[PDB]
Design a protein around this ligand. Structure first.
Ligand SMILES: CC1(N)CCN(c2nc3[nH]nc(-c4cccc(Cl)c4)c3c(=O)[nH]2)CC1
Length: 494
């Protein structure tokens, strides 16, 4: 599962791997190291290696010659389970994933860690089933499998250390099968746990949590992740978990809804999709939640504007968040679904009325009045916040611009009690849309609790990714999330 992604590798090493231990059809995904949002799909074909470029400017994974996908896993699953081909007839086959042996992108692997900290973190934050793998203390090359077992200083639990000999580029626990990587060793003993001779089972339930910190400790944790980087290693470890999020998207793949998606492969999950009553029922949108919830949808197509306002009306949405311009990178991202100032336009049975626009520095607020065409139908105020400062590529260099944009959107949601979920959307609705939702979630936690409780950015992103595919796209957006939370704390401290 996502073993085909080699995080620490250059192009010269990928050509040697596919030509040495790979056959025709063998493929791997490698990240362009110092080029942001540039990935390469290296496939062996006709004895040579073909490198297909994948660009991610912060909105989607753009595969040259293919389509646009939410994650690399959905990119791989789509061609191993459509088809990819060059501009000149010849087809490219994705057949055999060339597995990676680098464990630095795994949650349980720490490395250069001692039994002092291993037993310490497993005794404080630990829980029955928690485990970790660290570089060996006395045998340079080996590793130690520390497992906590039992209950929830009563002599209840314990920490059993399991030596993992590393010999001949294979990993063994000192008896039996010898695996090609530490991941293969942990995955084998996750299914079939070890049993000590006296009847205790070394079950590897969940990895040890090390990404949760106090919301006042945010300035230090960023300083540790800033340079040796920890930001990159903590993000790639999050990326290695997206293969667990390949859930069914059948409703988005139906022939009745092929044209209702701006990108035919970036589709909503079935278990969280937004269904539309009255009238079809489809719209590329998902329901996000941690109370206050969200709706994350794509940029409206010209044949989905009527469905967009049926969603806002039926779900009783009073706040809309637009995080992209009308046209960016020379291509259309979101059609104009809102009337101009001091005007009214009718979208199907709905009616939107622009009362007054307020042009701020970083965004534009529009006071809209939504109502269905009917006799006793009264309007209700829907506020559209249009963030215009966000650059075409990457993230803004100042979190304060996005910080002021969120707390103002937040206060508009409190002004209405019967309000529903906030509608956040960009181009595909996964990149900036995901970054805005996660930051607001982590901040809504902070403003309610203060600065004396816990926050977990990696767990929050994975929790949101399980509701819509590929939320928070690039590592720049991941780092910007920490900066926005760090910046919100800084204003509360003063
Ligand atoms: C030293 C080191 N090799 C291991 C720890 N480490 C890390 N990086 C992560 N990124 N994302 C997550 C995550 C994903 C889903 C749920 C949860 Cl609770 C966390 C995560 C995580 O657990 N550890 C940094 C690198």
């Amino acid at each position: 599962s996502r073993r085909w992604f080699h995080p620490n590798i250059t192009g010269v090493e990928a050509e040697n791997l596919l030509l040495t231990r790979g056959v025709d059809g063998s493929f791997l995904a490698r990240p362009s190291k110092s080029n942001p949002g540039d990935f390469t799909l290296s496939v062996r074909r006709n004895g040579a290696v073909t490198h297909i470029k994948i660009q991610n400017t912060g909105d989607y994974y753009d595969l040259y010659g293919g389509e646009k996908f939410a994650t690399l896993a959905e990119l791989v699953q789509y061609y191993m389970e459509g088809q990819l081909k060059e501009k000149n007839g010849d087809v490219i086959e994705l057949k055999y994933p060339l597995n990676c042996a680098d464990p630095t992108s795994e949650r349980w692997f720490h490395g250069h860690l001692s039994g002092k900290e291993a037993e310490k973190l497993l005794t404080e934050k630990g829980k029955h089933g928690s485990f970790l793998v660290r570089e060996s203390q006395s045998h340079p090359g080996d590793f130690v499998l520390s497992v906590r077992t039992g209950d929830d200083n009563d002599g209840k639990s314990k920490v059993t250390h399991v030596m993992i000999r590393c010999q001949e580029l294979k990993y063994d626990v000192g008896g039996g099968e010898r695996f090609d990587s530490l991941t293969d060793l942990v995955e084998h003993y996750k299914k079939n746990p070890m049993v000590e001779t006296l009847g205790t089972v070394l079950q590897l339930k969940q990895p040890l949590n090390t990404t949760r910190i106090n919301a006042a400790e945010i300035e230090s944790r960023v300083r540790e992740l800033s340079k040796l980087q920890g930001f990159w290693e903590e993000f790639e470890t999050l990326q290695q978990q997206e293969c667990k999020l390949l859930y069914s998207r059948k409703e988005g793949q139906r022939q009745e809804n092929k044209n209702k998606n701006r990108y035919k492969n970036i589709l909503p999950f079935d278990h969280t999709r937004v269904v539309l009553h009255d009238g079809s029922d489809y719209i590329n949108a998902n329901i996000i939640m941690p109370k206050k919830s969200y709706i994350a949808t794509q940029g409206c197509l010209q044949n989905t504007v009527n469905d967009f306002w049926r969603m806002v009306f039926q779900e009783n949405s009073r706040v809309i968040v637009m995080t992209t311009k009308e046209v960016e990178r020379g291509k259309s991202k979101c059609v104009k679904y809102w009337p101009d100032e001091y005007a009214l336009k009718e979208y199907g049975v709905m009616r939107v009325r622009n009362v007054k626009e307020s042009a701020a520095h970083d965004y534009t607020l529009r006071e809209l009045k939504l109502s269905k065409v009917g006799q006793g139908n009264t309007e209700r105020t829907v506020w559209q916040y249009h963030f215009r400062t966000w650059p075409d590529h990457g993230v803004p260099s100042d979190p304060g611009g996005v910080l002021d944009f969120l707390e103002e959107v937040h206060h508009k949601q409190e002004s209405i009690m019967d309000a529903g979920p906030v509608v956040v959307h960009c181009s595909a609705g996964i990149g900036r849309t995901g970054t805005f939702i996660v930051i607001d979630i982590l901040i809504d936690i902070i403003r309610e609790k203060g600065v004396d409780c816990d926050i977990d950015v990696p767990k929050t992103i994975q929790m949101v990714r399980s509701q819509r595919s590929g939320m928070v796209q690039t590592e720049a957006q991941y780092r910007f999330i920490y900066m926005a939370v760090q910046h919100y704390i800084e204003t509360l401290q003063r």
